[PDB]
């Protein structure tokens, strides 16, 4: 059913040399975890990434990307650091905010994980709009081809395509999971901070690739809102589902990212109340139809506590929405709360629906597979 993936003030990681990472949690533990991202492989293996915010919950702090791996259905976890920050700034060096994909890349089952990287910036990324792109920023990609046991950097052209665009100060994945399309294409939802001269500070889009090495940006942009977002594939559309204060937003592109229009079955269907929150949106088959499963916070206190992280089903045909399970029916820690990531898989005849989420500085896991008949029937 819950397991603890990463325990606030309860984990000890080691660095590249094998020396302990002394955090600010009791006993020198990692203080806080945020921003979970998960996938399930063809082997049934569960891999969960999260920020290991060793000293504090702040975004502007010393952060590595942790990875937890479970081969027993989420009962127990082997943990390590998958991506280390550059160790320039003991206060501020960070790799953060993962987005992951499990994919068959030219036959090879691969886990991709993409994180933003900063070193000396002491402010949030929206503060740095003078350069194309910001010199402190990068966006790095790591892969595993051994079922999540080891990760290695992927050399990409992502920094170059941002520079060539000329109107982007920084870019980040949409947070949680990206996707592999029916044709094989790899797609990461993205968020971007535009250069100062652009009237809109934030936009949403995606990057795409065939091999995981060479990526492309489409020519268009979607409106940013609170910019964290996921994409689903539905007929010859890509459909996003975007954080926004109040009602979540959803747009579709029928021309592979040149133009976006509102997608009625999801647009303004879930309310996250003041400030908004990241949410996870995926598809689940039901016969030759699809249902969208979505997780985000009800936010009953209308603030940064982001209470009641809940699973919804969206009927992609009728536009009906319903609450499936309030799986974290608790007031969150306003230092950083509310985020989640879903993962659905059918391996042979075994269908699984898993979630990970933020829980008072820890990351928890639940097996939500018992809900699948209810979700699938929502067509």
UniProtKB/Swiss-Prot annotation:
The protein's enzyme class: hydrolase
Example GO biological process: oligosaccharide catabolic process
Catalytic activity line of the entry: Hydrolysis of alpha-(2->3)-, alpha-(2->6)-, alpha-(2->8)- glycosidic linkages of terminal sialic acid residues in oligosaccharides, glycoproteins, glycolipids, colominic acid and synthetic substrates
EC number: 3.2.1.18
Molecular function as annotated in GO: exo-alpha-sialidase activity
Tagged with keyword 4Fe-4S: no
Disulfide bonds: 39-100
Keywords of this entry: Disulfide bond, Glycosidase, Hydrolase, Repeat
Record-level GO cellular component terms: cytoplasm; intracellular membrane-bounded organelle; membrane
Domain of life: Bacteria
BNR repeats: 68-79, 142-153, 207-217, 251-262
Annotated positions binding substrate: 34, 243, 306
InterPro entries membership: Sialidase (IPR011040), Sialidase_fam (IPR026856), Sialidase_sf (IPR036278), Sialidase_trypan (IPR008377)
Catalytic residues (positions): 59, 339, 358
Keyword Hydrolase assigned: yes
Gene3D superfamilies cross-referenced by the UniProt entry: 2.120.10.10
Coiled-coil spans in chain: none
Family per similarity comment: Belongs to the glycosyl hydrolase 33 family.
Function according to Swiss-Prot or TrEMBL: Cleaves the terminal sialic acid (N-acetyl neuraminic acid) from carbohydrate chains in glycoproteins providing free sialic acid which can be used as carbon and energy sources. Sialidases have been suggested to be pathogenic factors in microbial infections.
Subunit structure and binding partners: Monomer.
Record protein name field: Sialidase
Species the sequence originates in: Salmonella typhimurium (strain LT2 / SGSC1412 / ATCC 700720)
């Amino acid at each position: 059913e819950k397991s603890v993936v990463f325990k606030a003030e309860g984990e000890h990681f080691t660095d590249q040399k094998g020396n302990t990472i002394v955090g600010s949690g009791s006993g020198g533990t990692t203080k806080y975890f945020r921003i979970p991202a998960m996938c399930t492989t063809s082997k049934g293996t569960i891999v969960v990434f999260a920020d290991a915010r060793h000293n504090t919950a702040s975004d502007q702090s010393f952060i590595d990307t942790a990875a937890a791996r479970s081969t027993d259905g989420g009962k127990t976890w082997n943990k390590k650091i998958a991506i280390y920050n550059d160790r320039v700034n003991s206060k501020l060096s960070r790799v953060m905010s993962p987005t992951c994909i499990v994919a068959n890349i030219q036959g090879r089952e691969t886990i991709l994980v993409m994180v933003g990287k900063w070193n000396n910036n002491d402010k949030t990324w929206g503060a740095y709009r003078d350069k194309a792109p910001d010199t402190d920023w990068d966006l790095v990609l790591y892969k595993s081809t051994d079922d999540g046991v080891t990760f290695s950097k992927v050399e990409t052209n992502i920094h170059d395509i941002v520079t060539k665009n000329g109107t982007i100060s920084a870019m980040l994945g949409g947070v949680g999971s990206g996707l592999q399309l029916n044709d094989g294409k790899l797609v990461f939802p993205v968020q971007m901070v535009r250069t100062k001269n652009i009237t809109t500070v934030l936009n949403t889009s995606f990057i795409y690739s065939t091999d995981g090495i060479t990526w492309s940006l489409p020519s268009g942009y979607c409106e940013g809102f609170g910019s964290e977002n996921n994409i689903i594939e539905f007929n010859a559309s890509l459909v996003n589902n975007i954080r926004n204060s109040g009602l979540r937003r959803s747009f579709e592109t029928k021309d592979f990212g040149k133009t976006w229009t509102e997608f009625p079955p999801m647009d303004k269907k879930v309310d996250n109340r003041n400030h908004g929150v990241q949410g996870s949106t995926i598809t689940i088959p039901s016969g030759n139809k699809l249902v969208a499963a979505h997780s985000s916070a009800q936010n009953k206190n209308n603030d940064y506590t982001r209470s009641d992280i809940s699973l919804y089903a969206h009927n992609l045909y009728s536009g009906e929405v319903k609450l499936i399970d309030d799986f974290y029916p608790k007031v969150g820690n306003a230092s950083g709360a509310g985020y989640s990531c879903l993962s659905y898989r059918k391996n042979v005849d075994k269908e699984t629906l898993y979630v990970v989420y933020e829980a008072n500085g820890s990351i928890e896991f639940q097996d939500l597979s018992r809900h699948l008949p209810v979700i699938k029937s929502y067509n």
